Amino acid sequence: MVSFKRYELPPLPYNYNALEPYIIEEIMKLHHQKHHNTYVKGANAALEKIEKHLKGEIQIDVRAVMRDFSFNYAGHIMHTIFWPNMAPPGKGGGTPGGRVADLIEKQFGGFEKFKALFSAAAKTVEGVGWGVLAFDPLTEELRILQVEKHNVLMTAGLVPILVIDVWEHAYYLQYKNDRGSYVENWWNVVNWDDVEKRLEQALNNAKPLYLL
């Protein structure tokens, strides 16, 4: 038996104030240092309980510990995508090109229609959660969905290439109740270079994971 590899909190690809004016420094700081950090530690804690269980050292509720792992691991991986999905205005924002633009054109009828639908999905998440643009390994096509919490409505297979966090701690200090304005503004910091790179990996790698 080998002790599990621990999850670690990544640094941001930019400073805490680098996404101003669209997302203020205080949100970025709390969101990274408190919230994302909590999910990293929570994922590790659940794996530690599994480890101690397997070593005959403690008793565990398997369902409970796996629910804890699920929520925290999902919080961690969604955030690991979220941060580099954004970039300071200039590098961030604008209109995508490349394969992402092509698929957006073919499936959603262009960037404006895609933007409206993605925005709708993000704005209408019930409670806290995420708006998600994903690559489907079964059809090699894009799909949009919502995730509640970090780990409800998410499915196997689908590869998130672009996500927006609509947990209240992602916008409340700046936009208060007005999630809609937050979502509208977030477009100005989308790192389309990152999304394109994610799509290219998915195009090469995703289908074979399930092809078998």
- Of 4 and 21, the one with the shorter C-beta distance to a second copy is 4
Select from 107, 131, 149 the least CA-distant residue to 190.
131
Cα separation, 145 vs 154, in Å, equals 8
Select from 81, 64, 196, 210 the least CA-distant residue to 139.
210
Residue from 7, 14, 16, 192 touching a second copy (CB under 8 A): that is 7
34 lies in the binding site for a second copy (CB under 8 A): yes
Task: Judge contact between 146 and 153, C-beta under 8 A.
Answer: yes
Residue from 24, 98, 117, 180 touching a second copy (CB under 8 A): that is 117
Segment lying near a second copy (by CB under 8 A), choices 15-23, 57-65, 91-99, 182-190: 57-65
111 lies in the binding site for a second copy (CB under 8 A): no
Kindly list the strands in the beta sheet with 159-165, ordered across the sheet, starting from the edge strand earlier in the chain: 141-148, 129-136, 159-165
Cα separation, 129 vs 15, in Å, equals 24
120 lies in the binding site for a second copy (CB under 8 A): yes
Residue 132 CB, shortest distance to a second copy, in Å, is: 8
Using DSSP's 3-state secondary structure scheme, residue 199 falls into helix
- Of 55 and 90, the one with the shorter C-beta distance to a second copy is 55
- Annotated ligand binding at 79? The verdict is yes
- Annotated ligand binding at 169? The verdict is yes
Tokens 């290219």, residue?
200
Q: Which of residues 62-91 bind a second copy (CB under 8 A)?
A: 62-64, 66-71, 73-74, 76-78, 80-81, 84
Residue from 18, 23, 125, 183 touching a second copy (CB under 8 A): that is 125
Task: Judge contact between 146 and 121, C-beta under 8 A.
Answer: yes
H-only helix segments in the chain: 25-30, 37-54, 62-82, 98-108, 111-123, 172-175, 179-186, 192-211
Residue 21 CB, shortest distance to a second copy, in Å, is: 19
151 lies in the binding site for a second copy (CB under 8 A): yes
Residue from 91, 99, 115, 143 touching a second copy (CB under 8 A): that is 143
Q: Which of residues 161-190 bind a second copy (CB under 8 A)?
A: 167-169, 172-173, 176-177
Amino acid letter at 166? V
Which residues carry a binding-site annotation for Fe(3+)?
A: 31, 79, 165, 169
Binding-site residues for Mn(2+), please? 31, 79, 165, 169
| Residues making up the binding site | 31, 79, 165, 169
